[PDB]
Design an enzyme around this catalytic site. Structure first.
Site, PDB file in Angstrom:
ATOM      1  N   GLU A   1     -10.838   6.417   4.521  1.00  0.00           N
ATOM      2  CA  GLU A   1      -9.707   6.061   5.359  1.00  0.00           C
ATOM      3  C   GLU A   1      -9.907   6.638   6.742  1.00  0.00           C
ATOM      4  O   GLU A   1     -11.017   6.563   7.260  1.00  0.00           O
ATOM      5  CB  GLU A   1      -8.384   6.500   4.727  1.00  0.00           C
ATOM      6  CG  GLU A   1      -8.159   5.931   3.359  1.00  0.00           C
ATOM      7  CD  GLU A   1      -6.893   6.469   2.753  1.00  0.00           C
ATOM      8  OE1 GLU A   1      -5.822   6.102   3.284  1.00  0.00           O
ATOM      9  OE2 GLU A   1      -6.962   7.235   1.766  1.00  0.00           O
TER      10      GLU A   1
ATOM     11  N   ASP B   1       0.847  -1.182   0.000  1.00  0.00           N
ATOM     12  CA  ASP B   1       0.000   0.000   0.000  1.00  0.00           C
ATOM     13  C   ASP B   1       0.890   1.242   0.000  1.00  0.00           C
ATOM     14  O   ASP B   1       2.129   1.162  -0.015  1.00  0.00           O
ATOM     15  CB  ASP B   1      -0.959  -0.046   1.194  1.00  0.00           C
ATOM     16  CG  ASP B   1      -2.272   0.701   0.946  1.00  0.00           C
ATOM     17  OD1 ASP B   1      -2.285   1.617   0.113  1.00  0.00           O
ATOM     18  OD2 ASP B   1      -3.264   0.404   1.635  1.00  0.00           O
TER      19      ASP B   1
HETATM   20  C1  LIG Z   1      -4.284   7.928  -2.601  1.00  0.00           C
HETATM   21  O1  LIG Z   1      -3.607   7.430  -1.440  1.00  0.00           O
HETATM   22  C2  LIG Z   1      -4.197   7.652  -0.137  1.00  0.00           C
HETATM   23  O2  LIG Z   1      -4.045   9.078   0.097  1.00  0.00           O
HETATM   24  C3  LIG Z   1      -3.419   9.611   1.297  1.00  0.00           C
HETATM   25  C4  LIG Z   1      -2.798  10.994   1.032  1.00  0.00           C
HETATM   26  O3  LIG Z   1      -1.985  11.027  -0.151  1.00  0.00           O
HETATM   27  C5  LIG Z   1      -2.404   8.630   1.913  1.00  0.00           C
HETATM   28  O4  LIG Z   1      -1.751   9.098   3.113  1.00  0.00           O
HETATM   29  C6  LIG Z   1      -3.178   7.357   2.218  1.00  0.00           C
HETATM   30  O5  LIG Z   1      -2.466   6.484   3.119  1.00  0.00           O
HETATM   31  C7  LIG Z   1      -3.493   6.687   0.879  1.00  0.00           C
HETATM   32  S1  LIG Z   1      -4.349   5.173   1.296  1.00  0.00           S
HETATM   33  C8  LIG Z   1      -4.120   3.851   0.112  1.00  0.00           C
HETATM   34  O6  LIG Z   1      -4.016   4.371  -1.226  1.00  0.00           O
HETATM   35  C9  LIG Z   1      -3.772   3.345  -2.187  1.00  0.00           C
HETATM   36  C10 LIG Z   1      -3.384   4.044  -3.485  1.00  0.00           C
HETATM   37  O7  LIG Z   1      -4.286   5.126  -3.716  1.00  0.00           O
HETATM   38  C11 LIG Z   1      -5.064   2.542  -2.270  1.00  0.00           C
HETATM   39  O8  LIG Z   1      -4.979   1.598  -3.314  1.00  0.00           O
HETATM   40  C12 LIG Z   1      -5.368   1.828  -0.940  1.00  0.00           C
HETATM   41  O9  LIG Z   1      -6.672   1.143  -0.985  1.00  0.00           O
HETATM   42  C13 LIG Z   1      -5.275   2.831   0.226  1.00  0.00           C
HETATM   43  O10 LIG Z   1      -5.178   2.137   1.483  1.00  0.00           O
END
Ligand SMILES: CO[C@@H]1O[C@H](CO)[C@@H](O)[C@H](O)[C@H]1S[C@@H]1O[C@H](CO)[C@@H](O)[C@H](O)[C@H]1O
Ligand SMILES: CC(=O)N[C@@H]1[C@@H](O)[C@H](O)[C@@H](CO)O[C@H]1O
Length: 606
Positions: free
Chosen positions: A495, A289
């Site tokens: 999230e 991830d």
């Molecule tokens: C797009 O990523 C997310 O955004 C924030 C800020 O840039 C990060 O701090 C998060 O941890 C991630 S979460 C993670 O993103 C992956 C790629 O987008 C995704 O496939 C996955 O399901 C998420 O857990």
């Protein structure tokens, strides 16, 4: 086979395993580590991609060429990156990944399907397969070959900010919905070996079963936290759908930020190598991830040398860096040069990455197909989303007493009706998170039909439709309305921002429902990613519908409200009486739900 400058890995007629071995044997260490490196488009340039032999790019949430970009703009961006990768010595094409988790949802004008919790309510795996098929087309419309989906988390606590990305608290429903995979990728051959990766060709995408494993089991629904459960429980609840994903040829698996009994998944050799690869015989590639390896330590990023060592030795194949690629490549290179990471581990990672790329046809069709651009937001896909939205709706109440005439279905012909609430004319709210931005957004952020627009499109031409976002009781009583549709609920999130210990909807929500329903019979449409405290909304309402996060096609809601189709959705989650009960899942010894998993009233089409 034939020509003077013949190179076996470049021969499309050769077996995938022969092509993998032929290419692997020619690669430098820098070329190998390059394949294992995935970077954000935001840090990519032609020179970076060539000089570091980069294997993959992604768009994170909201990482777009510009606001409102067309399908062709996306194709041109991806092709520009690909041209740089194809210009390296070996010409290994990059794979471009994106979170296409309810349609191609970062993209302006993409069809937005209901989120997974609503799809669970449909109990219709073939519908979900068809959604996978449509999503693959809309992803390929933008030149992208890889979707980070499905999320097969089994959410065991709705306080989790990603509960809407889980089809159900019941692993059996999640297992059933793994049909998304052959939708996205194509159906596997009859002879197929479980655990082998598969993608049919240029009109399909690589999928990703995520997040391995127990992401839905964290303490108090805390995102990225600890999943405290014995092996029997892990294997009984959180693991089963991964075996279904193997049987269906899922091409990749993404590792969870979460821990299992205090061990970081991104460092868990026993589960990643011992179980996923060695026991389930997974032969695709395992991806981290986002900054997942960084988060092995506390604080995150405080010992990146250890992060690289621990993750790669655990068995991860590709690292979603996604920004500091120089540090990652340098550190991994040093670990290999120092004998800390054996060449056998690098070769395994690269073998798996190449296996997926060859299998999916990427070496044969590395560039976008401009004729696919028109798949984006194509009306047939919207009709499908509209069907899905409608099937996702769970009717929780339809009459305040057993003597009452059922409110739903509503008549399309009435002199005057009221549409109200914060969520009645807000496309961003009805789509929720992972729409245009990671956290979603408010208002008209893409192409779609709000609940208000859907009502106006459905009713008899003689029916006067009034909109008031937050009318007071007097306005409603004086308005001469036959009935009201009032839509309220949760704001968009994802999230950790969505982690929520109270699960009460923001105001004005309840106050508007009370003002409206106090004056006229009302159908309340609740827009949420999960069950929320609902007794006060029920007490006020004649009818109440749990609509989840239905996506861009609001006419799915009105199709049921006005009786074009009967309500058929069933709760894919327990509806709690109080957050003090949580966690509380179907099959628990002490199970005292407001509505049990599987509950859903029905109507007949009028
Ligand atoms: C797009 O990523 C997310 O955004 C924030 C800020 O840039 C990060 O701090 C998060 O941890 C991630 S979460 C993670 O993103 C992956 C790629 O987008 C995704 O496939 C996955 O399901 C998420 O857990
Ligand atoms: C395994 C894990 O991620 N545990 C975390 C802990 O580090 C942190 O103190 C807390 C934040 O409230 O959530 C939990």
């Amino acid at each position: 086979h034939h020509a003077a400058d013949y190179v076996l890995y470049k021969d499309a007629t050769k077996p995938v395993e022969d092509r993998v071995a032929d290419l692997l044997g020619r690669m430098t260490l820098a070329e190998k580590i390059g394949q294992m490196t995935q970077i954000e488009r935001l840090v990519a340039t032609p020179d970076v991609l060539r000089d570091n032999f980069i294997g993959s790019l992604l768009s994170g949430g909201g990482s777009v060429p510009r606001k409102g970009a067309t399908a062709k703009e996306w194709q041109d961006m991806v092709d520009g990156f690909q041209k740089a990768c194809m210009s390296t010595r070996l010409g290994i094409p990059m794979i471009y990944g994106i979170d296409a988790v309810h349609g191609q949802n970062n993209v302006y004008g993409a069809t937005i399907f209901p989120h997974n919790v609503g799809l669970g309510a449909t109990r219709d795996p073939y519908l979900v397969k068809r959604i996978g098929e449509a999503t693959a087309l809309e992803v390929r419309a933008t030149g992208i070959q890889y979707a980070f989906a499905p999320c097969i988390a089994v959410c065991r606590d709705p306080r989790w900010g990603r509960c809407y990305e889980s089809y159900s608290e019941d692993r059996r429903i999640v297992q059933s919905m793994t049909e998304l995979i052959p939708g996205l990728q194509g159906d596997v051959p009859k002879d197929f070996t479980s655990g082998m990766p598969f993608v049919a060709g240029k009109n399909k995408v690589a999928a990703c079963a995520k997040h391995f494993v127990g992401d839905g089991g964290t303490v108090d629904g805390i995102n990225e936290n600890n999943t405290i459960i014995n092996r029997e429980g892990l294997m009984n609840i959180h693991m089963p759908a991964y075996k279904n994903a193997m049987d269906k040829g899922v091409s990749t698996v993404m590792i969870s930020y979460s821990s299992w009994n205090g061990v970081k998944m991104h460092a868990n050799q026993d589960l990643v190598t011992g179980y996923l690869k060695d026991t389930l015989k997974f032969k695709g590639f395992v991806i981290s991830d986002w900054e997942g390896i960084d988060r092995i330590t506390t604080p995150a990023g405080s010992d990146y040398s250890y992060s690289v060592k621990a993750s790669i030795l655990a068995g991860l194949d590709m690292i979603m860096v996604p920004n500091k690629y120089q540090q990652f490549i340098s550190i991994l290179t040093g670990h290999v040069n120092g004998g800390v990471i054996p060449m056998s581990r690098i070769d395994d990672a690269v073998t798996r990455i190449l296996r997926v790329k060859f299998t999916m046809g990427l070496f044969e069709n590395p560039y976008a197909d401009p004729a696919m651009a028109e798949q984006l937001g194509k009306q047939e896909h919207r009709d499908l989303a509209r069907e899905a939205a409608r099937k996702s709706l769970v009717l929780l109440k339809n009459g305040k007493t057993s003597t009452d005439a059922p409110l739903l279905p509503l008549p399309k012909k009435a002199p005057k009706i009221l549409v109200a609430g914060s969520h009645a004319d807000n496309l961003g709210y009805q789509c929720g998170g992972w729409t245009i931005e990671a956290q979603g957004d408010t208002g008209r952020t893409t192409v779609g039909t709000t609940i208000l627009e859907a009502v106006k499109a459905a009713v008899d031409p003689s029916t006067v439709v009034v909109f008031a976002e937050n009318p007071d009781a007097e306005f409603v009583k004086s308005g001469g309305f036959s009935y009201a549709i009032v839509a309220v609920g949760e704001h968009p999130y994802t999230e950790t921002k969505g982690d929520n210990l109270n699960l009460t909807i923001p105001e004005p929500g309840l106050s508007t429902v009370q003002a409206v329903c106090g004056g006229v019979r009302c159908a309340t449409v609740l827009i949420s990613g999960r069950p929320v405290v609902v007794q006060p909304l029920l007490a006020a309402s004649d009818a109440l519908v749990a609509a989840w996060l239905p996506g861009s096609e609001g006419q799915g809601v009105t199709d049921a409200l006005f009786g074009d189709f009967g309500f058929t959705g069933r709760l894919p989650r327990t509806w709690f009486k109080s957050v003090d009960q949580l966690p509380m899942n179907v099959g628990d010894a002490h199970y005292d739900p407001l509505f049990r998993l599987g509950y859903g009233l029905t109507t007949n089409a009028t």
